[PDB]
Amino acid sequence: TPQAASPLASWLSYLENLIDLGLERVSLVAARLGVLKPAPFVFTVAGTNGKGTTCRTLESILMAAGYKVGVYSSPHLVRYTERVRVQGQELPESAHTASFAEIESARGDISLTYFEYGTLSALWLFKQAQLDVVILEVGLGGRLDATNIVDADVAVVTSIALDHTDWLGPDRESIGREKAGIFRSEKPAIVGEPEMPSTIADVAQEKGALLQRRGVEWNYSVTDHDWAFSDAHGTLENLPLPLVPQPNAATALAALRASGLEVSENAIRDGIASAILPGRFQIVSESPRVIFDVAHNPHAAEYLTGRMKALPKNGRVLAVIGMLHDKDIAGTLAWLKSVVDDWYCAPLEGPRGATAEQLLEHLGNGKSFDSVAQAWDAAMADAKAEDTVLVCGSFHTVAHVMEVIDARRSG
């Protein structure tokens, strides 16, 4: 058993090597720790896709508005510490190991899972920091996610589509019911998904939550160079085109206006203008245009394909791909194949990672490589200045490339 002085790596290894579902055990330990209400105001964000960027937008705006903000996020690209941000920054590794020692002693003989530990740890780090606002990204689903032991002041649903069907149900209706579990009596329930499953309205009714959905209570319009927003409180014009998916920026703005937090129009403009997340349609360079997007399911791949198609009339689209078997590979590739010209396949290490050959079988074309790095090198060697190189398929794939680019800065 590690201690507060142990290196973080020893903690994570200990946490990775570990019954009765339901939030009881995690709730009982959280009660002993007094972290059930991490800040005076909490936003909890659920959804199939766009949770991370909706959270980032909220954080950007609130920081410009002068609030002390904490953000819980998952998963992480490279380092575990990316998961807990305070004022947009990561916390010392020793802060994380101390919180782990605190949870370890507080749990007594109560057993916790990896995500339960990390969630309690984030709640603890936030409490210690004395913040005004805490933004929690749900780990998986809603009703049964560790983040649901906290009662959100504003609950958010970014989108609903298919992913984690093994846990959440086989359809949008069953998935929507689970995600909506984060709703609360008399609290705004912000739904940014344009085709809302009825089960979300059912759950809002069962709880007495205040449902405010895109297309009904609020809406937005776009232009080639800006956008406008509207809700029951009025409208906003000439907003900055976002650097995160357009639907998520509107969702965050809706949740923000519904919170009653005092935020000026200028703090809104500044926050929307600077909100961006590595690996979420990130334009890394030009000539050739390089893009990183961790789209790992059919709904996100369809969104990426729409973005790809909106790009200027180009040359060729080369793609560097690595995927995990626990995702709908065939479904994801079907969409991507509609815009990709040349495929460069690589394996992902471990148990759940697919081999280059497995991806290739789905593609029907392309070259296989020994690693993501070699695939990346090959794509960049072949790419012309008028082309676009896309690194996609998983967080692991985008991370492998960011790390190689970084290490080379040192050569």
Known binding residues for ATP are 50-53, 248, 280, 293
By CB under 6 A, tell whether 49 contacts ligand ADP. yes
Q: Does 184 bind ligand ADP (CB under 6 A)?
A: no
User: In angstroms, rounded to a whole number, what is the distance separating the alpha carbons of residues 131 and 168?
Assistant: 33
In the complex, which residue's CB is closest to ligand ADP?
50
What are the strands of the beta sheet with 342-345, ordered from one edge?
282-285, 289-293, 388-392, 317-321, 342-345, 367-368
Give the CA distances from residue 199 to residues 175, 228, 305, in Å, rounded to whole numbers and listed in that order.
9, 29, 29
Report the nearest approach of Mg ion to the CB of residue 50 (Å).
Answer: 9
Residues near 198 by Cβ (< 8 Å), separated by ≥ 6?
Answer: 173
**Of the residues 155, 156, 258, 300, which one makes contact with ligand ADP according to CB under 6 A:** 300
Q: Which residue positions form the known binding site for Mg(2+)?
A: 74, 137, 164
- Closer by beta carbon to ligand ADP, 258 or else 308: 308
Q: Number of residues in contact with Mg ion, rule: CB under 5 A?
A: 2
Residues 132-171 that bind ligand ADP (CB under 6 A): 159
Q: Are 94 and 128 in contact (CB under 8 A)?
A: no
Residue 294 touching ligand ADP (CB under 6 A): yes
Q: Residue 118 burial (CB < 10 Å; 0-12/13-18/19+)? A: buried
Q: Given the rule CB under 5 A, which of 48-56, 78-86, 178-186, 252-260 is the region that contacts Mg ion?
A: 48-56
Give binding residues as ranges. Answer: 20-22, 50-53, 74, 113-116, 137, 144-146, 164, 248, 280, 293
| Pairing state between β 317-321 and 219-222 | unpaired
DSSP assignment of 317-360 equals EEEEE--BTTS-HHHHHHHHTTT-SEEEE----SSSBPPHHHHH
Tell me if the bond preceding 288 is cis, omega within 30° of 0: yes
Say whether residue 303 binds ligand ADP (CB under 6 A). yes
Q: Select from 402, 407, 327 the least CA-distant residue to 76.
A: 402
Residues 51-80 contacting Mg ion, CB under 5 A: 51-52
Cβ 6 to ligand ADP shortest distance, Å: 30
Residue closer to ligand ADP (CB basis): 220 or 303: 303
Instruction: Single out the segment in contact with Mg ion by CB under 5 A; choices: 44-52, 64-72, 76-84, 187-195.
Output: 44-52
Do strands 367-368 and 342-345 pair parallel, antiparallel, or not at all (unpaired)?
parallel
Q: Which of 156, 295, 319, 401 binds ligand ADP (CB under 6 A)?
A: 295
Closest distance to ligand ADP from the beta carbon of 240 (Å):
18
Q: List all residues 6 or more positions away from 75 whose beta carbon is below 8 Å from its beta carbon.
A: 83, 395
304 binds ligand ADP, rule: CB under 6 A? yes
The residues that touch ligand ADP, with contacts defined as CB under 6 A, are 47, 49-53, 159, 245, 247-248, 280-281, 293-295, 299-300, 303-304
The residues that touch Mg ion, with contacts defined as CB under 5 A, are 51-52
